[PDB]
Design a protein around this ligand. Sequence first.
Ligand SMILES: [Zn+2]
Lengths: 132, 83
Amino acid sequence: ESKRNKPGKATGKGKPVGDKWLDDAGKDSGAPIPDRIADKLRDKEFKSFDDFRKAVWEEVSKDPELSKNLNPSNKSSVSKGYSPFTPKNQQVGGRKVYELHHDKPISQGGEVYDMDNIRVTTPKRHIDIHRG
Amino acid sequence: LKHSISDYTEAEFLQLVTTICNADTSSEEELVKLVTHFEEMTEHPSGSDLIYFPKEGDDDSPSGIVNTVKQWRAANGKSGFKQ
Ligand SMILES: [Zn+2]
């Protein structure tokens, strides 16, 4: 039914990030995938993009530089492989957690599992990006 | 019961908050549902920020969150816990 649901291996470098990593998610084209996460996920095979998403958040939970900027409740969430909650002012209706965005859209030939094509966004920012 | 704060004892509300804080669910969908329910029950302007983005020095443990809610509702003309 959908390209994002076909198996593939993860690739790409990502970028250095700091404590403000998730603050960047509400701005511009969103925050990059951290280089440290890309090191862990490169060459792993995933059954679907949702399985890749789970893996990102599990690695975030295990990374002390990334997890230290989540409060105890958000730490519990990422430990289950769930996306963490954004601040209230960045939520839209039932969309309350950080969202993975493809910079070059999949429907236009963008890569599904290339981490250099992936960004972390808030729901507010992601909706606005897709509306231009 | 589930429909308003006044249907919960304090102890029952602490149970709900504890489940949320520990992400003790079978899916992300279930956790989102509980968080939405919490925001609707409490009527607090901070919404889910009470759980995930505490003001500096605020107590974000489950019992801390319950206290914050209890005190705010009491001070802002809202009905309290059952019993
Ligand atoms: Zn997108």
